[PDB]
């Protein structure tokens, strides 16, 4: 319908490989569902083809460090 990933309010989304996600959850000492959640029907989740059980690596713009990295866990809904 319309491509929204180029909007200035939308940060970069990236699907994270299983080995990298496994290493991340081991080094954080958590279960995957203890991260902030993102829905599989999210407009940006569908743009990259994200399925539930994945972890999305998000890079946002920051006034203190320039670039900041965040992780979200894909849920159903």
């Amino acid at each position: 319908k319309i491509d929204i990933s180029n909007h200035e309010l939308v940060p970069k989304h990236e699907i994270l490989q299983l080995e990298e996600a496994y290493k991340l959850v081991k080094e954080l000492g958590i279960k995957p569902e203890q991260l902030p959640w993102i829905r599989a029907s999210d407009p940006v989740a569908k743009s990259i083809g994200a399925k539930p059980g994945d972890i999305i690596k998000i890079t946002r713009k920051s006034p203190f460090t320039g670039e900041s990295v965040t992780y979200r866990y894909v849920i159903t809904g």
């Binding site: 496994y22 959850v25 081991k26 279960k31 569902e33 539930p52 059980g53 849920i75 159903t76």
Partner: peptide, 13 residues
């Protein structure tokens, strides 16, 4: 499907 993803993650971990 949420339950199945949880079980797969538990078994992998």
């Amino acid at each position: 499907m949420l339950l199945k993803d949880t079980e797969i993650w538990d078994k992998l971990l």
